[PDB]
Amino acid sequence: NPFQFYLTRVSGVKPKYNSGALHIKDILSPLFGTLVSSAQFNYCFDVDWLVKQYPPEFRKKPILLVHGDKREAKAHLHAQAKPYENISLCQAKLDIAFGTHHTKMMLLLYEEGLRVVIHTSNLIHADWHQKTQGIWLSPLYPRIADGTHKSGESPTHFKADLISYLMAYNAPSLKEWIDVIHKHDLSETNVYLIGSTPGRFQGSQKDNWGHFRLKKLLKDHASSMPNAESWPVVGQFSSVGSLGADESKWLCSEFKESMLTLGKESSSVPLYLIYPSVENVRTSLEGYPAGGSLPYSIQTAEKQNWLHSYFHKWSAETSGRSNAMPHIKTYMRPSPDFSKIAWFLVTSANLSKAAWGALEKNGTQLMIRSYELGVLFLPSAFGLDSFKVKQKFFAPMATFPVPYDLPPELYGSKDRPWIWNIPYVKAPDTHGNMWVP
Numbered sequence: 023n024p025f026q027f028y029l030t031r032v033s034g035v036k037p038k039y040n041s042g043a044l045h046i047k048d049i050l051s052p053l054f055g056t057l058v059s060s061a062q063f064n065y066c067f068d069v070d071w072l073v074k075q076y077p078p079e080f081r082k083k084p085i086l087l088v089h090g091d092k093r094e095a096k097a098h099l100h101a102q103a104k105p106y107e108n109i110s111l112c113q114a115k116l117d118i119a120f121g122t123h124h125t126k127m128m129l130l131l132y133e134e135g136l137r138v139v140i141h142t143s144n145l146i147h148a149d150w151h152q153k154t155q156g157i158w159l160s161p162l163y164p165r166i167a168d169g170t171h172k173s174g175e176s177p178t179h180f181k182a183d184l185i186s187y188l189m190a191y192n193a194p195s196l197k198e199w200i201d202v203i204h205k206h207d208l209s210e211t212n213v214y215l216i217g218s219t220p221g222r223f224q225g226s227q228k229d230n231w232g233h234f235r236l237k238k239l240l241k242d243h244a245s246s247m248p249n250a251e252s253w254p255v256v257g258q259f260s261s262v263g264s265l266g267a268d269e270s271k272w273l274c275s276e277f278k279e280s281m282l283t284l285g286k287e288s289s290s291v292p293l294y295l296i297y298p299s300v301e302n303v304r305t306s307l308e309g310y311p312a313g314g315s316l317p318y319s320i321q322t323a324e325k326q327n328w329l330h331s332y333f334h335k336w337s338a339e340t341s342g343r344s345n346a347m348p349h350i351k352t353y354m355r356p357s358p359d360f361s362k363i364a365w366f367l368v369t370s371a372n373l374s375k376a377a378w379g380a381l382e383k384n385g386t387q388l389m390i391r392s393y394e395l396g397v398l399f400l401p402s403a404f405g406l407d408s409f410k411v412k413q414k415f416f417a418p419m420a421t422f423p424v425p426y427d428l429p430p431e432l433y434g435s436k437d438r439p440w441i442w443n444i445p446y447v448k449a450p451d452t453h454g455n456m457w458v459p
């Protein structure tokens with residue numbers, strides 16, 4: 023395979039379904055490189071746990087934690103890291119209300135080169151234990167020799183785009199990492215970076231971030247096909263924001279419109295949204311506690327019951343992970359019979375305006391509240407017109423490993439979306455327990 027897309031290891035599936043999965047301990051192993059320094063971008067951290075995932079010989083190498091916590095939460099994180107003198111922290115600025123630092127990324131500097139890991143897991147034990155999570159592993163990027171002048175740039179512009187993403191933090195610890203990236207050759211990179219950063223973007227900057235970034239890439243580097251209106255859009259996520267009083271206010275206006283872009287030429291496109299039902303969660307490996315990582319509040323949901331008609335159950339027989347609740351987020355464009363896809367995105371971005379951006383000022387400005395990061399797989403970046411869907415995830419190799427089942431299955435009439443702050447007391451979970459928030 024050329025895609026280097028992995029799932030995390032799941033405790034409690036047959037070994038067949040972890041062959042070619044990665045634990046965090048595998049990613050940080052000396053076999054991946056001799057670590058000199060690392061940066062861990064994430065949302066939440068168990069620092070004691072995190073240090074123990076590094077090889078013992080690497081545990082005193084510098085670590086930078088990039089987070090968005092403020093006030094007492096920030097103090098709690100500093101207290102966590104205080105026993106480790108090699109740990110530094112970078113507080114990502116969140117100057118728009120209700121924003122989050124969701125981006126999950128490792129920068130791994132080695133004696134041998136540099137690696138970038140863009141993934142979906144928090145740095146806590148539960149996120150790597152029994153959840154479905156996604157990982158993109160960059161190649162080992164070699165250092166550009168001193169005195170050599172070359173860009174180190176890929177046909178997907180990944181090196182400049184990652185530097186641009188880091189530049190938006192305006193942080194001195196991240197300028198150091200930008201200078202590291204400058205000295206390495208990233209030209210083998212075959213994915214496109216799609217980031218979100220907080221701000222209000224107008225003019226050309228509108229295309230830099232969020233769903234306008236996706237739209238720009240699809241217009242520039244994908245082609246439309248006959249019957250394109252028959253190719254569905256699939257979105258798959260672990261958290262749901264307030265989308266408005268009906269589908270026209272954001273979901274099916276600007277968001278779907280960016281998602282259905284293909285090529286430069288100018289809607290009945292089916293939209294499938296995949297989000298765990300209550301029954302998905304109850305019968306999962308973790309039981310109801312899996313719902314602690316599926317944040318959808320009743321206050322949000324009761325204002326948009328229209329949305330739940332779009333919802334499809336989580337099912338992942340293809341990867342043996344139907345009972346491993348998803349914390350991965352993915353978006354893709356399958357063919358009408360789901361046998362091919364026009365592109366695939368793995369990201370931190372949930373189904374929210376905060377993550378993807380909402381148009382403001384008469385459609386001229388894109389406002390984004392949060393930091394998000396994902397990578398986009400486009401057939402053109404691999405010399406292809408489309409990707410064939412891998413029928414069994416772990417089983418040619420121009421075949422893309424979609425980690426859950428197609429077509430997605432609509433909720434039944436008795437199903438309900440998982441809502442994390444209401445009780446479930448009708449039927450016990452796989453550990454014998456109810457859910458009482």
Ligand SMILES: O=C(O)c1ccc(Nc2c(-c3ccc(CCOCc4ccc(-c5ccccn5)cc4)cc3)nc3cc(-c4ccccc4)ccn23)cc1C(=O)O
Pocket residue numbers: 065066067068069120122123124144146260261314315316317370372
């Ligand atoms: O599904 C996603 O992807 C996603 C969705 C939301 C999100 N964070 C978020 C939350 C929120 C999320 C999770 C919790 C659970 C407690 O903490 C987890 C934790 C903490 C510590 C430890 C620990 C530490 C040391 C040792 C051992 N253990 C372990 C686990 C609590 C809260 N509540 C919000 C609310 C908003 C919001 C609010 C108002 C308006 C608009 C938005 C936004 C984000 N919110 C993070 C993720 C993610 O994974 O990045």
